[PDB]
Design a protein around this ligand. Structure first.
Ligand SMILES: [Zn+2]
Length: 180
């Protein structure tokens, strides 16, 4: 029914430096693992999905993440873009949060937040027009901050749910239905 693009946030630079947040779990690595599970969960409901992950040990700087992602996002004729992130603060911040650009994006964001909110703290959908992944993407886009990578309790919940458990909540939210 929908053609969906899933980008994984951040990358591993040529230096070996990872550009993501890092805490009790590495953000990039977690989302590299989640992305294909999320895609398959969408696919089970009949949607088509492309997963976009930056090449590893190719980029000189983080600036190449935009240059890599944007043309591919914009050449695929997608109905929806989702970029997967994990949040971070000082260890005390926790919960789920979805960033959006438009009123259409807000609809998706709120439902995703409510679904994740069944397990994590619902921090709410938040408008951010400054992010390139949102302001330079043709399709409606949302940036999902599923939980905090520097909060033990959040990550313990995630490992309890599993990738499939997190995926199901995101998919139910985006699709506005119950999968069970
Ligand atoms: Zn991130």
């Amino acid at each position: 029914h929908m053609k969906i693009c899933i980008t994984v946030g951040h990358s591993i630079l040529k230096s070996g430096a990872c550009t993501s947040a890092d805490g009790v779990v590495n953000e990039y690595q977690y989302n590299k693992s989640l992305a294909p599970v999320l895609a398959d969960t969408f696919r089970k409901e009949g949607h088509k999905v492309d997963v976009i992950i930056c090449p590893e040990k190719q980029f000189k700087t983080k600036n190449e993440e935009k240059s890599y992602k944007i043309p591919r996002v914009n050449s695929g004729g997608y109905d929806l873009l989702i970029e997967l992130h994990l949040n971070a603060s000082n260890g005390q911040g926790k919960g789920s949060e979805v960033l959006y650009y438009s009123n259409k994006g807000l609809e998706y964001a709120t439902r995703i937040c409510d679904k994740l909110g069944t397990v994590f703290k619902n921090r709410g959908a938040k408008l951010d027009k400054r992010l390139y992944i949102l302001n330079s993407s043709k399709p409606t886009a949302v940036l999902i901050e599923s939980f905090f990578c520097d909060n033990k309790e959040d990550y313990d919940k995630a490992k309890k749910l599993g990738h499939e458990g997190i995926a199901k909540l995101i998919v139910e939210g985006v699709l506005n239905k119950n999968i069970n």
